[PDB]
Every structure is written in C-alpha cells, then in structure tokens.
A paper describes a structure:
We show that the orthologue identified in A. hydrophila (AhlABC) is a haemolytic tripartite α-PFT, requiring all three components for maximal lysis, and we present the structures of the soluble forms of monomeric AhlB and tetrameric AhlC and the decameric pore form of AhlB. AhlC provides the initial single leaflet insertion, assembly with AhlB then producing an oligomeric hydrophobic pore, and finally recruitment of AhlA produces a hydrophilic fully active AhlABC pore. Structural and sequence analysis suggests this method of pore assembly may well occur throughout the tripartite α-PFT family.
Author numbering:
A (entry chain F): 17 to 342
B (entry chain J): 264 to 359
C (entry chain I): 159 to 263
D (entry chain D): 159 to 201, 209 to 263
E (entry chain G): 264 to 339
F (entry chain I): 54 to 105
Write the structure that this text describes.
C-alpha cells in the first residue's frame, strides 16, 4: 500500500463516521461537543485531500515527469550537429525549465506542509477525544464499584423484611392455635387457662404486626434497591458506549498517525527532488559560464544529476500510485 | 447455526451486488458502442473513422466486461463438511 | 487539590453509606417496634395500665425507624448525583496531571 | 508492602463503618426521644425526662461518631495515598525496567 | 442505520459535485484548445504531440484506473 | 510551554530536515563531479589540468 493509499484510507474511514448523540448521558455533554467538532474539521481536511491536494501533487509530478522523460540527458560536449551558440541556448533552456520545475516542486512541498498540519490536528483531536472518554469511563467505574456495595447492603434490609414477614405468618398460625386451646379450655372451666389465651393473642397480634410492618419495610427496601440498580445500569450503558466510541477514535487516530507518516514521507521525496533540481541548476549554470575541460566537468555532473532527478520522480510516482480498497 | 447461515447469505448478497455491477458495465459500455456506431454511420470520412475507432476500443472494452462476468460465473462449488456435534461433547456441553 | 477531592469523596460516600444504614437499621426498628408494641398493648389489657412504658417505647422505635427510612431516601436522592460529579472531576484531574507530565517528558 | 496495606485498609474500614453506625444509632435515638417528649407533653413529665435523656444521648453519639469518623477517614486516606505512591512507583520501575 | 445512511448520501453529493466539476474542467479545456487553435496560438501538430505524450502517461492512468475500478466493483 | 515545543518541532520539520536532505543532494552532486573527472581527463592528461 502506497503513501497516497494510506491517506485515502484515513479519508474514506473518517468521512463515513457519524456525529455521536450523547443527549441521554449528561455526564458526556462535553465529550459530544469535542467529538462532533473534531470530526467536522477532519471531514473538511479529508475532502480537501481528495478534491485538491492529491490531484495537485499527482498533476505536479506529471508535468515534471513528462519533461525529464524527454530531457533524460545533458549534452556535455558540443553535439555532432549543433554550433556553440545554439549549444549554450539548448542548455540555458533546460536551466530555465528546471528553475521553473524547481519552484513547482518547492510549492508542492508547501502544500504538503498544510496536509501534514491537517492530518496532525486530526490525530491530536482524536488523541484527546480518546483521553477524555477514558477519564469519564474511569470516573464511572469508581461509582459503579460503590453502587455495587451499596446494592449488597440494601439486600440485607430486603432479607430482614422477608424474614420479618415469614416470622409474622408463623407467629399468627401458631398464635391462632394456642389462642384456640386456651379459649376453649376457659369456656369449659372459666379461669383455669388464662396465661395461654393471653400468650396466644400476644403472638397473634405480634404476627400480623410483623407482617404489616415487614411489607411496608420491604416495599421501601425494594424501591430503594431498584433506584440503585437503574442508576447502575445507566452507568454500565454510559461506560459501554463511551468505550465503543472511544475504541473507534483510537482506531481513527492510528489511521491518521499512519497518514501523518505518509505525508511526512511525501514531504521527504519532494524535498529531495527540489534539492536534486538545485544541483542540476548549479551544474548547468557553472557549465554555461565556464571554459573547456571545466565546462565539460560540470555538464557531465549535470547529466549524472538528471538521472538522479529521474530516480526521485519514480519515487514520488510510487508514493502516489493507486486507489485504496474498501 | 443460523448465525453461520446469515454470514453465508451476506457473502451471497455481496457476490450478487458485484454481479449487478458487472452487468451494469456491460449494459453501459454497449450503450457507448451503439452510440459510436450510430454517429459513425450517419457522419462521413474522417469523423466516421473517429467514431468508428472509439467503437473498436469500446468493443475491446466490451470483451473485458464479458471476461469479467464469465469469471464471476464459472465453477461448481465443492461440498462443505460442517463438523457437527457428537454425543460425548453434547453430554459434556450440558454438564457445563 | 487531590486531597480535597479525595476528602469530599470520603464524605459523600460516608453520607450515602450512613443513609443506607438508616434504611437498614430503620426497617429493623420498624419491625422490631411492632413486635414490642403488640406485646405491650396486650400486657396493657392484662395488667390494667401497668406496662404503658413498653407500648410507648415500641411506638417510639417504629417512629425512629420510619424516620430512618424516610431520611435515608432524601439523602440517597441528594447524593448519588454529587458522587458521580466528584469521581469524574477526580479522573479528569489525574488525566490532566499525567498529560502535563507527558508534555514535560 | 502493597498487599499488607490492602489488609490494613480493609482492617481500618471497620472503624469508618463503626462510626457511621454510631452516628445513625445517634440519629435514631433523637427521632425517638423527640417523639417520646411530645408524648409526655400530653397527660406526665416522668416520660418527658426520658425523652430528653434519649435526645441528649442521641446527640452524644452523633457528636462522638462524627469525631471518630473524621479520625478514621484521615488514617485511611493516609493509607490510600501511601498505596497509590507505591502503585505509581511499581508502575514506573516496571515500565523503565522493561 | 438512518443517520449513517444520511452521512453516506452526503458523501455521495460531495463526490457527485467533484465529478460534475471534473467534466466542466474537461469541456472548458477542450474549448480553450479550440479558441487557441482558431487564433493560431498553436497547430494541430503541437496538439498532436501533447496528445501523444498524454496517452503514454496521464491517460493510461485514467484508463488503468477505469479497469481497476470496474474490477473492484465486480470483485475480480 | 506546549505551543513553544510544537514551534521547535515545526522548525525542525520545515527548516532543518530540508537542509539535511539538501546536504545529501550535495553529496550526490559532489560524487557526480568526482566520478566525472576521469571522463573529462583522458589517460595522456597533464598534472596541470588534473589540478585545474
């Protein structure tokens, strides 16, 4: 995969993302603003690479490449046909071609400056989007862990209440019975079984007592627990969705880091072309304004340097080859 | 099992969409050959030759389109053996 | 700043843990108190009016307990929100401090 | 040291727990004494006397609990912070070490 | 699914726009070539080489990219 | 602080790195000249023009 396919890959990935809606999560209001702002910016940057910059680089190398593909040599000794007046013009042409082709290379590199900065800002925006989401998540797990213990402690109250209600019914069934023995014995011989009737009702009243109370306490203990685990499953959702979104943006930041490296490497290739053309321009200049063996030396060097230009040109062309897949 | 089947169906859908695309190219490029042959016929001398030459290129393009479809559509798919569950693994999948 | 935040988390969590404790102990006193109240009210028509000390203490329990359930709710609504503020503020701060150190590195 | 501190923090959580129970026990006795008092203010005063004894005790446990809590939270936060310091030290030495 | 498909449609607008514009750049260039030729700024022989260099370089990329794209869309 | 750091990084990337790539271009040209001498100076050539 070429340097241009790297950047395309990032562009086609970022363009397809969707603004997040965290409206059901007030804790994430701010993470929402930052994301949707980061993304909108990256979307513009991505469009401009596809609409403008990639076309300009490719165009620019095309021009340069067409010219040196013809002028793939420097005549370093007066060529069989020409005279010396029109040798020195041929050379002066090329010097001026390459002076023009040099500025274009330099101006291509300055465009690549903008592209590097654009990718880097995006990479940065995504680094920060991930960092803030992790903060929020780490916050929430603190809370979840407290909510957990909190729920366990209420389960005590509920167990108590259930225990109370069951001890209640037992006291009622048993109390009813003891009351019945007591009460039926007093009817047959008034007086004799008084502490039994008495104990019977003590148990009976106590029982419905615990049943009624226990159920009250249970209704509250359930209410309280339910609030707790709905607060808890809101955080679980909040964590999950902060995590998915976050791991998406870790991905996008790696796609953008990759593109940064690629655009840096374009920067490098163009810097060499610019500098190799510099040498050519030097060699031709001194070539033109010098004498005998000297002239020839410079112009041989210029020729050697044109082959180097050609090298540099294939390098950039390898860099800008292709149409990244899906 | 129905998870694996929906995956197989999703691949099927991709392959059928890709069929659709290739047939659309044949369709559109034949529209171009038709367009060239017409304008060429009703034209005369150098302009004729122009349209007709493109027509030639297009016909070259049409064979591409054909060799591409023919590639999508050749082959008899081999038997697929889904290793299914045995008893000792099923009795073991209950115990867990 | 870190110790202040850590201290408030300690307070807000101690406030909630005690709110719960109220709800727990509370319910116990309610139930407790109903057993005691039944026993006293019956030992009140057995001993002509001797044991009104216990009917009273019984009812007083249920009232306590009930106030303990009713209070522990107020406090659990007006705390859960404030605890998530404090943790998020704490995690924010850890992250930002680290970012500062990373910039220095 | 880290594993020992973890037990130490566990151990000290009992004190914080104990002081919260205290406070709520206090608070309960006050709701109760407050109710027993308004009672006696009907009928005759023997019970009003209990009522205030109850609220006085209540407040005692709240005031004592509150002081016991401040202390025990402090002694714990000292442990946490010592721990997080080691935790950070293990993290650094490990990363550098690797 | 709905939100993602409005986003996918939006992408399709931006790229349709860039393609309409591309055709515009072509028809306009071809027009300048026509003007220029009609006022003797160059000859068919000039055009002839510029068009010969194109086919062996720049056009061979477009034409390459065509069968590359037809390929991707056909899965081949 | 950070902004001044990114300022230092930017000076490296856009002023120094290009000067380093330029140096390499100068190595290329210097050796083009060194290897060009035997080409320009055939066997029966004088010390004087070797020196020139």
């Amino acid at each position: 995969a070429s340097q241009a396919m790297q950047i395309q890959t990032y562009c086609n990935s970022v363009k397809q993302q969707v603004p997040v809606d965290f409206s059901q999560f007030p804790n994430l209001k701010d993470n929402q603003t930052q994301i949707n702002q980061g993304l909108d910016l990256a979307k513009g940057h991505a469009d401009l690479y596809l609409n403008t910059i990639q076309p300009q680089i490719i165009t620019n190398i095309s021009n340069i490449s067409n010219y040196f593909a013809l002028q793939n040599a420097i005549p370093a000794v007066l060529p069989p046909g020409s005279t010396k007046a029109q040798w020195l013009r041929q050379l002066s042409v090329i010097k001026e071609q390459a002076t023009e082709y040099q500025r274009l290379s330099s101006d291509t590199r300055l465009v690549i400056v903008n592209l590097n900065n654009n990718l880097i800002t995006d990479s940065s925006n995504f680094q920060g989007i991930v960092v803030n989401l992790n903060s929020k998540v780490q916050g929430d797990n603190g809370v979840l862990a407290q909510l957990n213990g909190d729920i366990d402690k209420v389960n005590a109250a509920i167990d108590g209440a259930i225990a109370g209600i069951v001890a209640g019914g037992l006291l009622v069934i048993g109390g009813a019975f003891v009351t019945a023995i007591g009460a039926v014995a007093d009817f047959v011989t008034a007086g004799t079984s008084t502490p039994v009737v008495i104990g019977g009702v003590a148990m009976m009243v106590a029982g419905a007592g615990g049943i009624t109370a226990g159920a009250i306490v249970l209704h509250n203990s359930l209410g309280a627990r339910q609030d707790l685990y709905q607060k808890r499953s809101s955080l679980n959702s909040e964590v999950l969705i902060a995590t998915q979104i976050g791991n998406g943006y870790k991905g996008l930041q790696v796609q953008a880091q990759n593109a940064v490296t690629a655009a840096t490497q374009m920067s490098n290739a163009w810097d060499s072309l610019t500098s190799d053309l510099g040498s050519l321009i030097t060699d031709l200049d001194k070539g033109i304004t010098s004498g005998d063996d000297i002239r020839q030396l410079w112009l041989t060097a210029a020729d050697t340097t044109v082959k180097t230009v050609l090298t540099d040109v294939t390098t950039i062309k390898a860099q800008m080859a292709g149409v990244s897949p899906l | 099992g129905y998870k694996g089947l929906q995956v197989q169906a999703q691949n099927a859908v991709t392959a059928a969409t890709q069929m659709s695309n290739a047939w659309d190219s044949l369709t559109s490029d034949l529209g171009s050959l038709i367009t060239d042959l017409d304008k060429g016929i009703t034209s005369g001398d150098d302009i004729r030759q122009l349209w007709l030459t493109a027509a030639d290129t297009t016909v070259k393009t049409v064979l591409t389109d054909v060799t591409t479809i023919k590639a999508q559509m050749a082959g008899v798919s081999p038997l697929q053996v889904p290793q299914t569950d045995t008893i000792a693994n099923f009795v073991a999948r209950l115990a867990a």
